[PDB]
Coordinates of C-alpha atoms in Angstrom, one line a residue:
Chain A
X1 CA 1.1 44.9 -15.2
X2 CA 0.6 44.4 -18.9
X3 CA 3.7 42.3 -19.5
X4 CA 2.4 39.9 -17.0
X5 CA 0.3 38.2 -19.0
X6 CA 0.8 36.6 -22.5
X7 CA -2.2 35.8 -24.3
X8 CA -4.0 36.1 -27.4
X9 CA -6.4 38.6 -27.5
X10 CA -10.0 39.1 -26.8
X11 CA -12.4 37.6 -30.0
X12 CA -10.1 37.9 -32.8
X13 CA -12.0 37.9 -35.9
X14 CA -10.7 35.3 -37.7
X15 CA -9.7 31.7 -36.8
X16 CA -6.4 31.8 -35.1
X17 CA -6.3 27.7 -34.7
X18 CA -6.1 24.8 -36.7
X19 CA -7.3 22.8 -33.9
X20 CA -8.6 19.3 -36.1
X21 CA -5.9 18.2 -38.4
X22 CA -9.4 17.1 -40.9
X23 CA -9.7 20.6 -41.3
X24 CA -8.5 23.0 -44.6
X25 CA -7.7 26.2 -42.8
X26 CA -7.8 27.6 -39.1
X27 CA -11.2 25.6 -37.7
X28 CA -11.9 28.0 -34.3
X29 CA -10.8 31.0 -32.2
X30 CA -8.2 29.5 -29.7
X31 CA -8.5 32.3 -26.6
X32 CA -5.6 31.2 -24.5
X33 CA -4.6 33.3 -21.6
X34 CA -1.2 32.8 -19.2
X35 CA -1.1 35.2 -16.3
X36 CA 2.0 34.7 -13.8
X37 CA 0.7 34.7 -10.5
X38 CA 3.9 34.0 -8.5
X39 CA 5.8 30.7 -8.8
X40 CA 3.1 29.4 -11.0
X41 CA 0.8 30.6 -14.5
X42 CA -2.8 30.8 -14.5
X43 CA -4.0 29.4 -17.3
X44 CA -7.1 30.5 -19.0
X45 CA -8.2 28.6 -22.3
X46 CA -11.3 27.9 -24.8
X47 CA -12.3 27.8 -28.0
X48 CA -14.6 29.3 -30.3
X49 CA -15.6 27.2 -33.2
X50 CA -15.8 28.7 -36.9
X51 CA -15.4 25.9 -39.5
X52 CA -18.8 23.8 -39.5
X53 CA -16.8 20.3 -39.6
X54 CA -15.7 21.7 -36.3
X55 CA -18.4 23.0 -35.3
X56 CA -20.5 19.7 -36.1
X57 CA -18.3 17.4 -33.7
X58 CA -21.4 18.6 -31.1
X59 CA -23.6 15.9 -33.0
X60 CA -21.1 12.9 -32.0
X61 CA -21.3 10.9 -28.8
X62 CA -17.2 10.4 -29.0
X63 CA -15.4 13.5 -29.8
X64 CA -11.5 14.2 -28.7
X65 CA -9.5 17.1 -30.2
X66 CA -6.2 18.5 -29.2
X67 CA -4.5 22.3 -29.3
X68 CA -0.8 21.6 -29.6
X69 CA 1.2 24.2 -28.4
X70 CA 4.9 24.2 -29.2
X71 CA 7.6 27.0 -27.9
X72 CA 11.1 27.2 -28.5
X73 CA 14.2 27.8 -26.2
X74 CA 13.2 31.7 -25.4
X75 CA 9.7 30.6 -25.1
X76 CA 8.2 32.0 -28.9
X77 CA 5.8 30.0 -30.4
X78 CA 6.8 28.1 -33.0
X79 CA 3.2 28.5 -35.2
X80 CA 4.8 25.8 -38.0
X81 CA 4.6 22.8 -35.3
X82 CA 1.7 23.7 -33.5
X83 CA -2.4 24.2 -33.9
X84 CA -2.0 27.4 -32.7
X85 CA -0.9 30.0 -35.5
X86 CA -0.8 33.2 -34.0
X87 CA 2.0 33.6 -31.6
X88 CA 0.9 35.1 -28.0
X89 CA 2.0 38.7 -26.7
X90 CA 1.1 40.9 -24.0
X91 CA -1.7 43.0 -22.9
X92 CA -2.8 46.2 -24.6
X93 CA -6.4 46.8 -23.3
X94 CA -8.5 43.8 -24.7
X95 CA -6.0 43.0 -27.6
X96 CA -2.6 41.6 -28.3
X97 CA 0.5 44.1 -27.8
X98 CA 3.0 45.1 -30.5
X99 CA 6.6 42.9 -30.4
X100 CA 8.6 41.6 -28.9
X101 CA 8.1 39.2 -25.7
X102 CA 10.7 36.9 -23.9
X103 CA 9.9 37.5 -20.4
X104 CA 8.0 34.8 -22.5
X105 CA 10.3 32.1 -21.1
X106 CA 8.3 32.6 -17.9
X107 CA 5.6 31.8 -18.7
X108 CA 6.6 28.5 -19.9
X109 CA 5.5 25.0 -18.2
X110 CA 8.7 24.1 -15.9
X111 CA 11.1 21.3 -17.1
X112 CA 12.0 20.6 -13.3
X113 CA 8.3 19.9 -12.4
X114 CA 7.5 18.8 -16.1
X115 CA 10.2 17.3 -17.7
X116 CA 10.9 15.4 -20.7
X117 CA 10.5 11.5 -22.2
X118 CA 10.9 10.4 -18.4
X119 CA 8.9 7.5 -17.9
X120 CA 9.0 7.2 -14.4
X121 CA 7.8 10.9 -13.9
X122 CA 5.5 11.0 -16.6
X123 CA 2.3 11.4 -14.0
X124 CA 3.7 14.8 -13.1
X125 CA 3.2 15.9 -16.4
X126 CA -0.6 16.1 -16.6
X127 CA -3.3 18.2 -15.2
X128 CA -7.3 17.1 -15.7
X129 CA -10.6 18.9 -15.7
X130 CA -13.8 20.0 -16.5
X131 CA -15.6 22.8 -19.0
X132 CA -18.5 22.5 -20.7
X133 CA -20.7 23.2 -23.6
X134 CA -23.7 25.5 -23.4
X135 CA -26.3 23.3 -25.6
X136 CA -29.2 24.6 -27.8
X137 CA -31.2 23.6 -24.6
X138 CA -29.0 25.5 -22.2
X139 CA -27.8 22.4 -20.4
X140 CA -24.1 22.1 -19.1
X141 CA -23.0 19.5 -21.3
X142 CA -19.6 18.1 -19.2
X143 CA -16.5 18.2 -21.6
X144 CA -13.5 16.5 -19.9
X145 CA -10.2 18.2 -20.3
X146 CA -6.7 16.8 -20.3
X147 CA -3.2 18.9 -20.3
X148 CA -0.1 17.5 -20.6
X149 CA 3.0 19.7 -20.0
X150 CA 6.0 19.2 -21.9
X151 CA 6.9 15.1 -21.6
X152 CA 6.9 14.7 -25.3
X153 CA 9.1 16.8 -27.8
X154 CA 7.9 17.0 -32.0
X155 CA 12.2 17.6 -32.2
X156 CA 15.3 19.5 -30.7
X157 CA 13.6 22.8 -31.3
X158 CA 10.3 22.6 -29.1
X159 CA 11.9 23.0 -25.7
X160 CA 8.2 23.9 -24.4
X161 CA 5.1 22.3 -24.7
X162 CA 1.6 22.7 -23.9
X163 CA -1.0 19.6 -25.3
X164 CA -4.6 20.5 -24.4
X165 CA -7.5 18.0 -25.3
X166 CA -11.0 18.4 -24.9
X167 CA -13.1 15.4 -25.1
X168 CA -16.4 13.6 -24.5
X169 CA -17.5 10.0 -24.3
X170 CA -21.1 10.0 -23.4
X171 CA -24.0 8.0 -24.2
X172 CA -25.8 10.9 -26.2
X173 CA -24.5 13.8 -28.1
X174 CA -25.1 17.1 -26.7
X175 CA -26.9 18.0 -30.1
X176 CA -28.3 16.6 -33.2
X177 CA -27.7 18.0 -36.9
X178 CA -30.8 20.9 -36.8
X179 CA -30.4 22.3 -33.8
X180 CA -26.4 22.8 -33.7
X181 CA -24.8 25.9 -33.9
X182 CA -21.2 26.8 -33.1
X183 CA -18.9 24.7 -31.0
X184 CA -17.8 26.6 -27.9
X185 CA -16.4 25.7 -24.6
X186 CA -16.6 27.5 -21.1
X187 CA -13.3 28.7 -20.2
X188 CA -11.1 26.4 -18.5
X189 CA -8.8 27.7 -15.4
X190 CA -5.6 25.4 -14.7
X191 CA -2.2 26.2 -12.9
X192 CA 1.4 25.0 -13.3
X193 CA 4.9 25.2 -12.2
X194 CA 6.7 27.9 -14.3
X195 CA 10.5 27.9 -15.6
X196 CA 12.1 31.2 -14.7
X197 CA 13.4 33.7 -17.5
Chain B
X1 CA 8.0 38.5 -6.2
X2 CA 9.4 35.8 -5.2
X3 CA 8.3 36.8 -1.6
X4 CA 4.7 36.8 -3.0
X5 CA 5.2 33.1 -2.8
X6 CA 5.7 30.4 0.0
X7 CA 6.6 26.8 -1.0
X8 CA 8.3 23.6 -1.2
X9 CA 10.5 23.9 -4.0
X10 CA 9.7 21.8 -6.9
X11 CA 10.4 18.0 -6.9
X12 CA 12.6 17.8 -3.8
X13 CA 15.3 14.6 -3.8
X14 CA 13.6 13.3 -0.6
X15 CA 9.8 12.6 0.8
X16 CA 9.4 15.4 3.1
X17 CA 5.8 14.2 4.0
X18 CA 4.6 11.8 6.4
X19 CA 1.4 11.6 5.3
X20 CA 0.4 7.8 6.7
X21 CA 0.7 7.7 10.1
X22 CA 1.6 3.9 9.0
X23 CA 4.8 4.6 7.6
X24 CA 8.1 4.7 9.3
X25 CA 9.6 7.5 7.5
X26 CA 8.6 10.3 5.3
X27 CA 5.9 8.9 2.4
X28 CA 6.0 11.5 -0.2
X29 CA 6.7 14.7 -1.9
X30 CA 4.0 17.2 -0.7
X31 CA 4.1 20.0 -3.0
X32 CA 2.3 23.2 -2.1
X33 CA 2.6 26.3 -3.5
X34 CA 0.5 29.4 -1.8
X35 CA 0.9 32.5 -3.6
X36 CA -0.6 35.6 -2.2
X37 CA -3.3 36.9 -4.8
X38 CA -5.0 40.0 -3.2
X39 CA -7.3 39.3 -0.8
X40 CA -6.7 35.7 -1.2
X41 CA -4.3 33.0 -1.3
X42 CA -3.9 30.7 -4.5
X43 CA -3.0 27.3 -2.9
X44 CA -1.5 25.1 -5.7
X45 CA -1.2 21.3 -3.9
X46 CA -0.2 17.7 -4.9
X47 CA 1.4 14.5 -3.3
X48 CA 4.7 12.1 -5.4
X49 CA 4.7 8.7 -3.9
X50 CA 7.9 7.6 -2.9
X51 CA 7.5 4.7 0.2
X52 CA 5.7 1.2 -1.3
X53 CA 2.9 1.1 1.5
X54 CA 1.8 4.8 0.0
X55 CA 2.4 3.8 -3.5
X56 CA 0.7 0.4 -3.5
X57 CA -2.5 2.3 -2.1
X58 CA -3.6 2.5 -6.1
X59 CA -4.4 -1.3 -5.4
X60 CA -7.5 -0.1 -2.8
X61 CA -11.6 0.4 -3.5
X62 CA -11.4 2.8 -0.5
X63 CA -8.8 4.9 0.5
X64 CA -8.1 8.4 2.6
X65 CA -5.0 10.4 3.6
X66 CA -4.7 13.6 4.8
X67 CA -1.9 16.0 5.1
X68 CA -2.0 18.2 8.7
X69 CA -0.2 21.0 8.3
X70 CA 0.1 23.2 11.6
X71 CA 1.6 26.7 11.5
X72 CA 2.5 28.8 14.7
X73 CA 1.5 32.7 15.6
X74 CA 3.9 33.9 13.1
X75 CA 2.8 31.4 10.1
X76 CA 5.6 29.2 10.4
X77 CA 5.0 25.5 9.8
X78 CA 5.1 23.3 13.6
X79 CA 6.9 20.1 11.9
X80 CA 7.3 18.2 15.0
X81 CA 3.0 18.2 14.7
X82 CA 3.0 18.3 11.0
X83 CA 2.6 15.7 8.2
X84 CA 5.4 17.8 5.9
X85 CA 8.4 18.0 7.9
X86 CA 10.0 20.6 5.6
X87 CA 9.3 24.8 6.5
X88 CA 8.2 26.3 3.7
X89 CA 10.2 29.1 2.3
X90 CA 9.8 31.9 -0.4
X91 CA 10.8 30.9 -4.4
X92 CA 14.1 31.2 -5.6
X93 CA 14.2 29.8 -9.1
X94 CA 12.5 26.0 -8.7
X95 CA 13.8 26.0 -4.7
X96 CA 13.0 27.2 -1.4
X97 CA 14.8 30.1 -0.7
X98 CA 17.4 30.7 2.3
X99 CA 15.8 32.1 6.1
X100 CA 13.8 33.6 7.0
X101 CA 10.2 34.1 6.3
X102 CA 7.3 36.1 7.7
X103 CA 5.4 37.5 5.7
X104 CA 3.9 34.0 6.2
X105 CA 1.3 35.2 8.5
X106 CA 0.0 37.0 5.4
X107 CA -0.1 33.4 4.1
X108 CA -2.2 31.7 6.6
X109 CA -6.0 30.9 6.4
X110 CA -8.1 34.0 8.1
X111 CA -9.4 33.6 11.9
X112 CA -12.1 35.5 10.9
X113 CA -13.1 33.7 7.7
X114 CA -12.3 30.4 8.7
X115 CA -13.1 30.0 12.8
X116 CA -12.2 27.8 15.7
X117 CA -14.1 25.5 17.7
X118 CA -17.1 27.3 16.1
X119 CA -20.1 24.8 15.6
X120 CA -22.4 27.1 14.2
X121 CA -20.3 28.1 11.6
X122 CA -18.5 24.8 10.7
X123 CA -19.3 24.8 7.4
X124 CA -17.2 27.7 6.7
X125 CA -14.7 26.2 7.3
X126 CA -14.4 23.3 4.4
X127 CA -13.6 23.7 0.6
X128 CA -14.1 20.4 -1.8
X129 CA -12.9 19.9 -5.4
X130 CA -11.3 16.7 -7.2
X131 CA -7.7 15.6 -8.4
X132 CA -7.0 12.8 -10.7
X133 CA -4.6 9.4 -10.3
X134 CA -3.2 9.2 -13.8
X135 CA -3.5 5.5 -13.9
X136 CA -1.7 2.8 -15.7
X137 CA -4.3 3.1 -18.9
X138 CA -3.6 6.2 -18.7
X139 CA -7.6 7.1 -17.6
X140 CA -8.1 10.1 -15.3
X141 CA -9.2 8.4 -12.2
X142 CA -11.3 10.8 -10.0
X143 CA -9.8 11.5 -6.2
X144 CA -12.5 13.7 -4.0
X145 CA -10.2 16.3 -2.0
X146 CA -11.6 17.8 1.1
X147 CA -9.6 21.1 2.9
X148 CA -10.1 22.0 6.3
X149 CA -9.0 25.8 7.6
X150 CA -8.1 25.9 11.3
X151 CA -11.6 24.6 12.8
X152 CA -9.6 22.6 15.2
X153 CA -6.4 23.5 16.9
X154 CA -4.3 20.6 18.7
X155 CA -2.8 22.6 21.2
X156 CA -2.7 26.4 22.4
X157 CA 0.4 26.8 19.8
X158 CA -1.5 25.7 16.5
X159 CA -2.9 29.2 15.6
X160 CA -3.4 27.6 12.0
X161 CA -4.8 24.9 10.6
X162 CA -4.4 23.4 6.8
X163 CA -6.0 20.0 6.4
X164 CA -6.1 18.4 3.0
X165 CA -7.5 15.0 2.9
X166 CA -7.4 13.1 -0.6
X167 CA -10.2 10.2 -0.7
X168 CA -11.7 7.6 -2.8
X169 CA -14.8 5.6 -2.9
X170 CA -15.3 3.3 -6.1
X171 CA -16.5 0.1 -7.2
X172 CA -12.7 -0.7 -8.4
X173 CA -9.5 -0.3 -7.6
X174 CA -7.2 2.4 -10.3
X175 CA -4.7 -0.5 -10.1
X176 CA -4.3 -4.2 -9.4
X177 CA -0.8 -5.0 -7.9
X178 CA 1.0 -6.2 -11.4
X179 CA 0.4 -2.7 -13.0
X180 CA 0.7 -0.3 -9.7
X181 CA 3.7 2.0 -9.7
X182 CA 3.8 5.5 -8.3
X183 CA 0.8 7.4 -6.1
X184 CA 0.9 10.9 -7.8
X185 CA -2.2 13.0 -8.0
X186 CA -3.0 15.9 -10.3
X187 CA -2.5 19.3 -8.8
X188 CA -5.4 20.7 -6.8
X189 CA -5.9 24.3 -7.1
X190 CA -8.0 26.2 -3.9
X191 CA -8.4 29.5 -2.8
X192 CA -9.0 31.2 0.5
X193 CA -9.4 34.6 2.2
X194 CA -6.0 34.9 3.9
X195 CA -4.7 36.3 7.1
X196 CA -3.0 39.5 7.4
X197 CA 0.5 40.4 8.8
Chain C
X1 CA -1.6 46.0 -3.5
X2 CA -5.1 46.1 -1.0
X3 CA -6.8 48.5 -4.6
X4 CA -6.3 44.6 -6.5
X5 CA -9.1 43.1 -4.6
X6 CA -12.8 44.3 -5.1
X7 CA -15.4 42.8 -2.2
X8 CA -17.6 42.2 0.4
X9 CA -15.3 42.1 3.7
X10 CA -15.3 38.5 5.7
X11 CA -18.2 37.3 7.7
X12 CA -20.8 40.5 8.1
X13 CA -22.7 40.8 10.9
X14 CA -25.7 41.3 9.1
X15 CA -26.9 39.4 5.8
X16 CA -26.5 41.7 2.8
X17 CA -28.1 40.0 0.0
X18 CA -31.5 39.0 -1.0
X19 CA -31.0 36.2 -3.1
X20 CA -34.3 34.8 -2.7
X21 CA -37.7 37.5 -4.2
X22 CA -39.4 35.4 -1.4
X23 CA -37.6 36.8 1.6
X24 CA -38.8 40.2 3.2
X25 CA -35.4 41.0 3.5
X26 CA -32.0 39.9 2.8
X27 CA -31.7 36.6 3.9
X28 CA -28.1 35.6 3.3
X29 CA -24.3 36.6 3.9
X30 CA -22.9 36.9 -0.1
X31 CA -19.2 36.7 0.2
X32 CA -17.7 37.8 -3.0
X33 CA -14.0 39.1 -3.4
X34 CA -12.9 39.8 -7.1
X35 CA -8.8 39.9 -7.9
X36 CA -7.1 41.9 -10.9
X37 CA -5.1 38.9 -11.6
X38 CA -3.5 40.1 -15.2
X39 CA -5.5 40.4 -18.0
X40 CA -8.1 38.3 -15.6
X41 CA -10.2 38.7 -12.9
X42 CA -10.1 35.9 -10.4
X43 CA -13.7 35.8 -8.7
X44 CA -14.2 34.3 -5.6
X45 CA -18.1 33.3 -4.4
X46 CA -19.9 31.7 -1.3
X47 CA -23.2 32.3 0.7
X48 CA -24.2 31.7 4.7
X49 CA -27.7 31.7 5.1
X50 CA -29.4 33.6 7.6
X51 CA -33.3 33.6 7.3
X52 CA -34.8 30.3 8.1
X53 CA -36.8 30.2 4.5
X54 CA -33.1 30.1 2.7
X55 CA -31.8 27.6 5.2
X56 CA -34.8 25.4 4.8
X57 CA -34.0 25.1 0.7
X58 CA -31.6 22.0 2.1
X59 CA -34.7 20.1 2.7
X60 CA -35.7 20.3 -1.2
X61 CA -34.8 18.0 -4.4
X62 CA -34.5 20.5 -6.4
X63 CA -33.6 24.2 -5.9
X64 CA -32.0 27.5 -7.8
X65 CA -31.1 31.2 -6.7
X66 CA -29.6 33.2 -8.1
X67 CA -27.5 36.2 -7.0
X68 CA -28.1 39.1 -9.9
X69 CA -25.4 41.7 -9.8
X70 CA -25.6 45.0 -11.7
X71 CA -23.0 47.5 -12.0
X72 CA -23.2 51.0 -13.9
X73 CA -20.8 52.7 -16.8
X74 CA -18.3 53.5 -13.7
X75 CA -18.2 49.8 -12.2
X76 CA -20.5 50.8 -9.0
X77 CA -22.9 48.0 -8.2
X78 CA -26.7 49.1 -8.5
X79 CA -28.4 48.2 -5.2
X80 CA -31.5 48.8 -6.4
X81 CA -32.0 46.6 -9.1
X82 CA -29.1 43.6 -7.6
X83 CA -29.3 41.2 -5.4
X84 CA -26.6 42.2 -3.4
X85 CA -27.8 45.5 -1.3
X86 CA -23.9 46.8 -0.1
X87 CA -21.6 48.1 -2.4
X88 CA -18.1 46.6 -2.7
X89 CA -14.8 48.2 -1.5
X90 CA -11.1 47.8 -1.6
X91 CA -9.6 45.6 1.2
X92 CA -9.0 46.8 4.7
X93 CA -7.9 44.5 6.3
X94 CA -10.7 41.5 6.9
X95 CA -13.2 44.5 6.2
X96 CA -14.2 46.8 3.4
X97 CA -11.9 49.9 3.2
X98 CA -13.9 53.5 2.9
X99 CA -14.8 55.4 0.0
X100 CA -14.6 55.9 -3.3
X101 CA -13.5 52.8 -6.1
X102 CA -13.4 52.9 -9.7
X103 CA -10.4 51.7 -10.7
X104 CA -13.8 49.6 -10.1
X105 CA -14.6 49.8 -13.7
X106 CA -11.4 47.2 -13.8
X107 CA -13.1 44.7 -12.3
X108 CA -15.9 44.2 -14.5
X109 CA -16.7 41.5 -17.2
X110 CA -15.6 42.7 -20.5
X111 CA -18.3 43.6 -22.9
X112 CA -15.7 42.6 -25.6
X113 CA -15.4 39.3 -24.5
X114 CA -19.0 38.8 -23.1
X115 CA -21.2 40.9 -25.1
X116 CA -25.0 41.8 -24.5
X117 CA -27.7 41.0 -26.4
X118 CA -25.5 38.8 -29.1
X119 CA -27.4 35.9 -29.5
X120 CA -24.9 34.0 -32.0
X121 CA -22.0 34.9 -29.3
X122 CA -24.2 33.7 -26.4
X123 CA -22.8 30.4 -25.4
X124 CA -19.5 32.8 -24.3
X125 CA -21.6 34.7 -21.9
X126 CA -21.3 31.5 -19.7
X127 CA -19.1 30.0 -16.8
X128 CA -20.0 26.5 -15.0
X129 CA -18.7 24.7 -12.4
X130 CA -19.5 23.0 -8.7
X131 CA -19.5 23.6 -5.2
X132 CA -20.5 21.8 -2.3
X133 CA -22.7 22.1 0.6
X134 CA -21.2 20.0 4.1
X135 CA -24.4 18.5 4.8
X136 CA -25.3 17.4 8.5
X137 CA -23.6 14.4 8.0
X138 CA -20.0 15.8 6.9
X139 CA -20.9 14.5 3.5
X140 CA -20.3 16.9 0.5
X141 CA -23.5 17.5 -1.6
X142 CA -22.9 18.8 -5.0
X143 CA -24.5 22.1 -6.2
X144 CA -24.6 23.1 -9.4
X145 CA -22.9 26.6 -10.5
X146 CA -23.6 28.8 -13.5
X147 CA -22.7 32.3 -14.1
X148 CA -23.7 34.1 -16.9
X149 CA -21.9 37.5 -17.9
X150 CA -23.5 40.6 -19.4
X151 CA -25.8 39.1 -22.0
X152 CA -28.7 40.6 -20.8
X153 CA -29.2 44.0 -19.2
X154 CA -32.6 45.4 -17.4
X155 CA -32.0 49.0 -18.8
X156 CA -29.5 51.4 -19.7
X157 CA -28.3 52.1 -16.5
X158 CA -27.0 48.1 -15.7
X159 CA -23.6 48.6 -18.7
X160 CA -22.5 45.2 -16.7
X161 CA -24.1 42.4 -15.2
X162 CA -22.7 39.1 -13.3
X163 CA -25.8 36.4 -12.9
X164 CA -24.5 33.4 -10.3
X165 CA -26.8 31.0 -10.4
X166 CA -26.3 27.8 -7.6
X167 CA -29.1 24.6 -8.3
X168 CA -29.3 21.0 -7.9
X169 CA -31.5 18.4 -9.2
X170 CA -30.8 15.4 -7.1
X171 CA -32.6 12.0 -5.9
X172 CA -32.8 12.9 -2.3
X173 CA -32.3 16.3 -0.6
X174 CA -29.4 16.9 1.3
X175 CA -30.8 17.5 4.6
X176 CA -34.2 16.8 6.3
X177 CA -36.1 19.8 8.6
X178 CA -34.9 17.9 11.7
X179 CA -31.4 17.9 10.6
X180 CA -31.1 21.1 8.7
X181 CA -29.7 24.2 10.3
X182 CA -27.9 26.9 7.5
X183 CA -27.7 26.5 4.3
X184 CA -23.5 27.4 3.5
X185 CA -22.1 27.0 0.3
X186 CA -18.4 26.3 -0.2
X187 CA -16.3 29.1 -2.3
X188 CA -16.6 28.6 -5.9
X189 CA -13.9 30.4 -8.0
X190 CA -14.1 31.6 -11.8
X191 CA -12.1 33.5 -13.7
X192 CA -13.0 36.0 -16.9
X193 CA -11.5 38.5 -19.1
X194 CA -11.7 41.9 -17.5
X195 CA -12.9 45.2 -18.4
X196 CA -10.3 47.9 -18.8
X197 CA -10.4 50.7 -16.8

């Protein structure tokens, strides 16, 4: 049952995401996880925050940020493209197996249900939601959340994509400089179509 | 695993929906994906406008539609009293597969969890959540989904019921007439305790 | 595959949770079913009230209960201290199977990913989300849904805890005590990293 899941581990202790573009270095613990559950993935995602420029966006009423996940032909993540820097493997009890994927390919967003720079399909593409942010106050501050599934390739090589934004646009922020912490979001639970190995 | 799943196929050429009693052909592509997950079935569920009438429904303040999907003693889909007019069959690759299914009982919404005709229980019998109309702006308009299980049978040969009724009731329409295009909603994702074999 | 699901059988005669300290016994059905799905657990949640004090709560503005569930090292749930008074089993059927779990210990959180007592890991202790009550109107009221993961044990016996919490905090309550009759919540489904055997 291990191999049906890809994902990237439980807590890893460093940042494994460079998730704001503003940042010099990973900025947060990406936890992504993609179980295959029939003819679709479960897909399990949040973040951790680490870098206090990251972890300061709690202070803003208008924050958006963006995990860009880019995967090649056989489904390997190509870590130069994307926010993401440590590529995904299996399950080995609450960590990341040893080599080598590529049943990996499906787990990947479908082309036929998600595909490619086609305008007249491109509403297919994207799944929406809600997770939220555990305050200093222990209020459920709402945190919309938009994925778009492949519709727009970086070049020729990412045959995959997963674009995941978080965002808020509220008339407060959920905290003010002395009482924020760290940055973290509830997990976040979507489904899509998968492409077959 | 592919019989772990029963489904449309992904992005079929033609509607296979009728979901407007108003239209005089098939309306849209109803995708739904169940996958049998334990105890439970994973129901994965979205609608691709194809016919104007559906499509131009953007342009509306107020607006329900609900796909009726009746299934026989044996779990197959009754199209004759059905919105979708297309059985469902197992996956093969992005398609329906070829005969002949049956397991499908295994897919249908429990008698036991999900009554009929039973007023003191009723309220079992509903789940809620909320899809999103990618609109022209490319905002995330909100569409309130209500799913009925069985509850009410039409005749003595609907032994299931699925009723999944998209709605909205806002001070605007997502569209005005010059900007409308195609009705798609996000995929809805619900769970229930299914039937066995 | 009927060792993958973890619950309370469908629709038990008797209730078998006291959710509220107030009752003199338990005073509601907890319908609970928990699926290995992959590295995952998929965890699926609902309540039918049966004493008239829990139905009543749908004549308030503001209400919260919470359903404490406490396991030991082997995954077995503590009666004594939980909420929930009968132990989960496998699935037989619509019913529990008999005897003895643990491949139980599967099914808990992990205390990797949701740690106890870790107060500068604590916002990842949390889940949040919303399900509804079909008020006597057919209307869907919005309740509020937390859940909160390990974090907090009551001794050394309880090595994992799950804390579902529903509340609202609304204008108006959804029912008045001429219209109000049981108080049924609509399943909510979460999803966490899960404990390894």
């Amino acid at each position: 049952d291990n191999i049906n899941t890809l994902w990237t581990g439980v807590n890893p202790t460093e940042a494994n995401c460079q998730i704001m573009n503003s940042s010099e270095s990973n900025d947060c613990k990406l936890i992504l996880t993609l179980v295959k559950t029939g003819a679709l993935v479960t897909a399990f995602v949040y973040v951790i925050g680490v870098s206090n420029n990251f972890n300061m966006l709690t202070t803003h009423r208008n924050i958006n940020f963006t995990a860009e996940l880019f995967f090649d032909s056989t489904g390997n993540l190509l870590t130069r493209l994307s926010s993401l820097k440590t590529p995904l493997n299996h399950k080995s009890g609450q960590n990341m197996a040893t080599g080598a994927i590529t049943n990996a390919k499906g787990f990947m967003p479908s082309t036929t249900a998600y595909p490619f720079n086609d305008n007249s399909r491109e509403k297919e593409n994207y799944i929406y939601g809600t997770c939220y942010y555990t305050a200093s106050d222990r209020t459920a501050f709402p945190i919309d959340i938009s994925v778009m599934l492949n519709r727009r390739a970086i070049n020729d090589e990412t045959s995959y994509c997963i674009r995941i934004t978080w965002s808020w646009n509220t008339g407060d922020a959920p905290e003010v400089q002395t009482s924020a912490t760290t940055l973290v979001t509830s997990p976040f639970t979507f489904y899509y179509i998968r492409e077959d190995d």
